Amino acid sequence: KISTSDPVRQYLHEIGQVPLLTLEEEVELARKVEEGMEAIKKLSEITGLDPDLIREVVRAKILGSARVRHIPGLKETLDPKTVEEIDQKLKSLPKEHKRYLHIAREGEAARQHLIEANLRLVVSIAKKYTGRGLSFLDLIQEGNQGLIRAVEKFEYKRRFKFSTYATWWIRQAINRAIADQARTIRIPVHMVETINKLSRTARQLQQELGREPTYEEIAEAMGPGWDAKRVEETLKIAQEPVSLETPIGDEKDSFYGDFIPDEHLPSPVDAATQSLLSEELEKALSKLSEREAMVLKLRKGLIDGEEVGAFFGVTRERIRQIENKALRKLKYHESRTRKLRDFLD
Template sequence: MYVPRQQRMLDQYLQEIGQIPLLTPEEEVELARRIKQGDQEALHKLTRANLRFVVSVAKKYQGQGLTLADLINEGNYGLIKAAQRFDETRGFKFISYAVWWIRQAILQALAEQSRVVRLPLNRIGTISKIRKTSAKLAQIHERQPNIEELAEEL
């Protein structure tokens, strides 16, 4: 059976990152300290250990205009930015901090690359909220909501 090259590469990537061991919270703190001192190897180790999480976040955004591989790639940029900015002294786990950066990178890529007309990210968020609210009201009332109902719910 023929499997497209891009799918084979993605499968291989997923298999490879599945082999990377997770870090303990203590290791995360130590790596964050080293990253602040400019240690590129520490940056590499911290980001590699969290690549699986990027995949899980990226999967939630499938079907919105970019391939899974592109979503993962953008999420990885967010992960690197999070690793560079992480402040270990605040007592949070790295991944709790990184999830925001990962989502931001993915949402930014979707906003810029998946539409014919580019919309600002805040407008895309507003449109998404309206669509979700409309779907919720449609399910409750078993009909499409009117503008007044939508405005009241929002």
């Protein structure tokens, strides 16, 4: 039906059935996650397989079958045969290293478990970064990505619990997202804070003048290198765009984009231009020596805009010689049979 309530219910129901106890459960899972790490590395050490590989095979066996490996990541790990080979060597690990295998999996579980339990934490957080320009679900989701990040670095040896730790790792993820996706025309985090500062400042300035600050105040109040050109620029980027399609005038049926003309397209007038221009330019190009005329014709009209580097073997003296003598005989006979004079442009 309507999307927010369902997920809210969705995880709030699962937290409702499994919140994590303050110390015990978070301690428990934490301990298992770390042991998993220490396990997977020791597995890498004895199998010579990359910890990345050991991590994905334990994931498959605990999180999902061939289905989850084939659709998500296209196909480099054979759906069946590949992962399985890897599990076999894991079995072969005698009593000593088999232990790590068994631990890795259970640890992997804990992870996902701890991650589940602290989803209320995200939503509570993500709740306040609401009106920034991101969808609540989008916001919770990035924040979610943030909590997963926290899970990778938390050291349970250092007594502090996951609560205060997740907060940071989540707030970071959110703010980033807000600054990275909120606008159509991307704007790095600095410009963002810049804009918040600009706004905030404009607020303190609205406080007493009764005059929406000329861009003079904003410069001053902002600080060190702020000037009028800077503020007019920043608020010009701050304006989000407009719907190219917006209801216009009497919104009966007016869509904004019919009124913008087109520039690359040669309006008839131009197509006609290019025809005579090319036909007459082509007539002159022939009745001439195919030497310094083509040099300057190709150097100017075929590639890019070098007198010396313009002519093949013959040096500068013959270039200027024929360039300026042919260019003028060409212009002065074109002065006679006036065809070009009427500036095609």
